[PDB]
Amino acid sequence: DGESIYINGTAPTCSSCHDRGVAGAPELNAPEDWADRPSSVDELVESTLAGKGAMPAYDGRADREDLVKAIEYMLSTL
Ligand code: HEM
Known part of the structure; x- marks a missing residue:
């Protein structure tokens, strides 16, 4: 889900920074x-x-x- 994407299904991994x-x-x-x-x-x-x-730029x-899925997941914690 969005959580999976945010935590590990992203390159660079969002988690590592955010x-x-x-x-x-x-x-x-x-x-x-x-x-x-x-x-x-x-x-x-x-x-x-x-x-x-x-x-960095994520385009590609x-x-x-x-x-989107990662961002809505991020925002859902606010
Ligand atoms: C992983 C794919 C990832 C996501 C998703 C993500 C999202 C995100 C948003 C939505 C913002 C705000 C955009 C806006 O202001 O309009 C945001 C801002 C910053 N991020 Fe990020 N981010 C992802 C990954 C990463 C990585 C890997 C880093 C660290 C190198 C990082 C860092 C930052 C910083 C810094 C900002 C904004 C700083 C500023 O000038 O306001 N993000 N991110």
Whole structure:
């Protein structure tokens, strides 16, 4: 599911950064970190595909669908 994707079914693995908050990556169950961001999954996924700050571009490494499933999973902890 989205959890599987987020934890291990991603390359690079989202967990590795977001679990700890590497380079200030918006963490899980941390609504404040997301409040300011365009929380809309459909927007967040673009940021994810393109890359943001330390986050590399995902375009090709993870499909929008994969990403979406991971992102909604991330957001569901907030
Ligand atoms: C794994 C595929 C993965 C997902 C999914 C993911 C999502 C994600 C979102 C939705 C954001 C916010 C986008 C926005 O602000 O519009 C976000 C932000 C950051 N991430 Fe991420 N992220 C995934 C993976 C990784 C990896 C592997 C790293 C560490 C190199 C990482 C880091 C960050 C950082 C830093 C940001 C934003 C920093 C900023 O400038 O605000 N993410 N991620």
